[PDB]
Design a protein around this ligand. Structure first.
Ligand SMILES: [Zn+2]
Length: 225
């Protein structure tokens, strides 16, 4: 079908983790692409594209309409998780293309609303460790992770569950550590390089800034060794 869309790798790898038949909220949906993909293929039952300001809201609305999916995809202008209600019967939430602190904040601000959500697929752009820390502290459990190239992007798949993570697992990812893929090694090899430039750029007097860097460097050296 000519209106079928092909997702970016990043968004495709998120879509691959959305359960069949899901009723999905995509928070700050990227032009509603991901909900359109999932609905046009019949892989989900229903979706909401949640947008925070008028431009993106209008974009998603137009796209859903053009793709002939207005009956199956709601587009809403609402702050974070306010984009859904009990009556919507959402079981899955995706949040992509934002920093890990921001994702954790959106989740924390509306934590009560997650009570009936079964699965989250989260694609942080950075500060992944801060998102992992928030998940661990709030009775969420990571059940799968992926790292992909396109930049490298991490995807975390989450369900309710009590999880304890080590500092290493928080920083590197319990599943990313275990899978230990080439992409993973390349990401951390690159961080090592940057941190090594950073540490040599800072004066010896700045003991605290240097210590922070030394701590990161050693962690990485351990993982890579
Ligand atoms: Zn607990």
């Amino acid at each position: 079908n000519a209106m079928d869309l092909q997702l970016s790798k990043r968004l495709q790898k998120v879509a691959n983790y959305v359960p069949k038949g899901a009723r999905l909220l995509d928070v700050g949906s990227d032009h509603a692409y991901l909900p359109i993909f999932l609905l046009q293929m019949g892989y989900c039952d229903f979706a909401i594209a949640g947008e925070v300001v008028n431009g993106p809201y209008q974009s998603a609305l137009k796209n859903v309409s053009e793709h002939g999916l207005t009956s199956k995809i709601d587009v809403r202008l609402a702050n974070g998780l306010s984009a859904f209600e009990e009556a919507d019967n959402i079981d899955t939430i995706t949040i992509c293309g934002m920093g890990g602190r921001l994702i954790a904040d959106i989740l924390n601000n509306d934590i009560d609303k997650l009570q009936h959500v079964k699965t989250l697929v989260l694609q942080p752009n950075n500060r992944e460790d801060d998102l992992r820390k928030w998940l661990a502290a709030n009775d969420f459990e990571i059940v799968a992770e992926d790292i992909l190239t396109e930049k490298r992007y991490e995807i975390l798949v989450v369900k309710h569950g009590h999880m304890n993570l080590t500092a290493k697992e928080l920083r590197f990812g319990p599943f990313l550590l275990s899978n230990n893929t080439t992409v993973f090694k390349e990401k951390w090899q690159n961080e090592l390089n940057k941190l090594t430039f950073a540490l040599n750029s800072i004066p010896n007097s700045k003991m605290e800034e240097r210590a922070i860097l030394e701590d990161k460097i050693q962690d990485i050296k351990e993982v890579l060794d």
